[PDB]
Ligand binder design. Structure first.
Ligand SMILES: COc1cccc(COc2cc(C(=O)O)ccc2-c2nn(C(=O)c3c(Cl)cccc3C(F)(F)F)c3ccc(Cl)cc23)c1
Ligand SMILES: COc1cccc(COc2cc(C(=O)O)ccc2-c2nn(C(=O)c3c(Cl)cccc3C(F)(F)F)c3ccc(Cl)cc23)c1
Lengths: 263, 260
C-alpha cells in the first residue's frame, strides 16, 4: 500500500510527536531505574515511614494514606489524559474525523494507553513517581488497605508481561496511535475513515518493529495480542473503580475522568 | 546567499505549501469571484439549518455557539496543517525539539489569521473546503459577544488582502512568522534567527520579482506581521472570555481538552 519511505516518514513523525507530548519517556525511565548514575537517582518509598519522609524530600493531604496515594495516581492519570489528547491531535487524520468520533476515540482509548505507558515507569519491584524523582515499591502499594491494595497490583501484573516485549519509545509511539484509531469503539459514526487511518499506522508499526527488532520474530502479532487484552484489564479496572466509589465518599473523581466513565 | 539559492528556497516552500494546505488562495479566489460548482451560501438562520444538512459538517454534536465550534474545529485542523508545513522549512527539524514546540505554539494563531484572509472577501468567508460560503453580515450579527468576535478577522482580511499576495508569496511569509526568535521561552535563538534571515532574504527577492511595480511591499508586509501580534492577543483575550462566560461553552471535558 504505502511505500516504505512513506511509512518510515510516518514513524519519525509519530515518535517526534510522542517526545513532544510526554514529559517522562521510557528511555529516561530506564536510565533512572538502571542506575550507574548519581544525578538521576530516585527516593524510594517502601513503607509508611519512608512515605512521610517522602513528602518532604520529593515534594509532590489531610486524608488517610491509601486515599492520598489514590489521588496521586488520579492526578497523574488526569495529566496523562491531557497528554494523550494532545498526542492524538498529531496523528495524521485524527483531527479531520467527525468531532463526535474524536471524543468517542479518546474516551475509550485513554485508559488503554495509560496502562501501556505506565508499564514504561515500572519494573517487577515498583513504579516511578513524581516525574521520576520518586519510586514506590510494588509491595508497599499491594499492602494498602481494604480494596486499594488489589486496585494497584493489576497494573504491575500487566507491565511485567508488557515490558517483556522490550519496546522502546519509537515503537510505543506507533502502537499508542494504533490503539486510539480503533474503529470498533462503541457508538462511532464513520468506522471507515478511522479504519483507513489505522491501516497505515498498522503498516507503519509492522515495518518499524521489523527494522528496530529484526531478531524478534512475530513481535507485531505478539504486540497486537497485548493490545486487545487491554480492553478487559480496563473494564476490570473500571469494575474495581465503581465498587471503590461506593464505599469511599472521600474519593473525588476529576471531571475529565468522570465524563470518561459515564459511558 | 546567492540569488539562485533564494529562488530554490522559494520554490521548495511553495511546493511544500501546496502539499500541506488543501484549499489554496488561488483556488479560494476562483470560487469567491465566480470563476469556477458553486458553494452553498449561509446568510441567515434558515440557510444555516439547510447548510449543515447539505454541506455535512464534522463539528456537529444554540446557533452562535455551533458556528463558534465550527471555527474552533477548523483551526485545530489548520494547526496540524501548519505543523506539517513547518517540518518542510529547511533547518526547522534540526532545531531543539522544545523550540520547535515553542515556535509552533505561538506561531499557529498568526498563521491561521493570515491564511484565513485567503478564504475571505468583504462579504463573507469560505467554509468546508469551499463548498460553503457564510456571509460576513450574518457572522457580524451573532448575539452577545460572538458577533464582535467574528468581525475583527474580516477587518484584518480586507486590509491584508489589499496587498494582493499569492500562494508563492505567502509560502515564504508563513515561514518567516514561524521562525521568530523572540518567542518566550526559546532556548537557542541563534539558529532560529539564522534561518529567518534566509527566509527574509528569499521573501524580499520573491516580492521584487512577483510584484515589480510594488515599492516597499516587503516593508508593508513586515508591518502586517507585527500587527498580527496584537490582533492575536486581543483574540485570545476574547476567546478566553467565551470559554469562561459561556459555561455551556465549557461542554464536554474531553472536548475542552481537545481545544485547550
Ligand atoms: C504520587 O502518587 C503516586 C503513587 C503511585 C503511583 C503514581 C503514578 O501512577 C500513575 C502514573 C502515570 C503516569 O505518570 O504516566 C499514569 C497512571 C498512573 C496510575 N493510575 N492508576 C489508576 O488507578 C488510574 C488509571 Cl491507571 C487510569 C485512570 C485513572 C486511574 C485512577 F484514577 F484510578 F487513579 C494507577 C494505579 C496503580 C499504580 Cl501503581 C499507578 C497508577 C503516583
Ligand atoms: C460553521 O463553520 C465555520 C464558520 C465560520 C468560519 C469557518 C472557517 O473558519 C476558519 C477557517 C480556517 C481555514 O480553513 O483555513 C482557519 C481559521 C478559521 C477561523 N478561525 N477563527 C477563530 O476564531 C480562530 C482563529 Cl482566527 C485562530 C485560532 C483559533 C481560532 C478559534 F479557535 F477561536 F476558532 C475564526 C473566526 C471567525 C471566522 Cl469567520 C473564521 C475563523 C467555519
Amino acid at each position: 500500500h504505502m511505500e516504505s519511505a512513506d511509512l518510515r516518514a510516518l514513524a519519525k513523525h509519530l515518535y517526534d510527536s510522542y517526545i513532544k507530548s510526554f514529559p517522562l519517556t521510557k528511555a529516561k525511565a530506564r536510565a533512572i531505574l538502571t542506575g550507574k548514575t548519581t544525578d538521576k537517582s530516585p527516593f524510594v518509598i517502601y513503607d509508611m515511614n519512608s512515605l512521610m519522609m517522602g513528602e518532604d524530600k520529593i515534594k509532590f493531604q489531610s486524608k488517610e494514606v491509601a486515599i492520598r496515594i489514590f489521588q496521586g495516581c488520579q492526578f497523574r492519570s488526569v495529566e496523562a489524559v491531557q497528554e494523550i489528547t494532545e498526542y492524538a491531535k498529531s496523528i495524521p487524520g485524527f483531527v479531520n474525523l467527525d468531532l463526535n468520533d474524536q471524543v468517542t476515540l479518546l474516551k475509550y482509548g485513554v485508559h488503554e494507553i495509560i496502562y501501556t505507558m505506565l508499564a514504561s515507569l515500572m519494573n517487577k519491584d515498583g513504579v516511578l513517581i513524581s516525574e521520576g524523582q520518586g519510586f514506590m515499591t510494588r509491595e508497599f502499594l499491594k499492602s494498602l488497605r481494604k480494596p486499594f491494595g488489589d486496585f494497584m497490583e493489576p497494573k504491575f501484573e500487566f507491565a511485567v508481561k508488557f515490558n517483556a516485549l522490550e519496546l522502546d519509545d519509537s515503537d510505543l509511539a506507533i502502537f499508542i496511535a494504533v490503539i486510539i484509531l480503533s474503529g470498533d469503539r462503541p457508538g462511532l459514526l464513520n468506522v471507515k475513515p478511522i479504519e483507513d487511518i489505522q491501516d497505515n499506522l498498522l503498516q507503519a508499526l509492522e515495518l518499524q518493529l521489523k527494522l528496530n527488532h529484526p531478531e524478534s520474530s512475530q513481535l507485531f502479532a505478539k504486540l497486537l495480542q497485548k493490545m486487545t487484552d487491554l480492553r478487559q484489564i480496563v473494564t476490570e479496572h473500571v469494575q474495581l473503580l465503581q465498587v471503590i466509589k461506593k464505599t469511599e465518599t472521600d474519593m473525588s473523581l476529576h471531571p475529565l475522568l468522570q465524563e470518561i466513565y459515564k459511558d
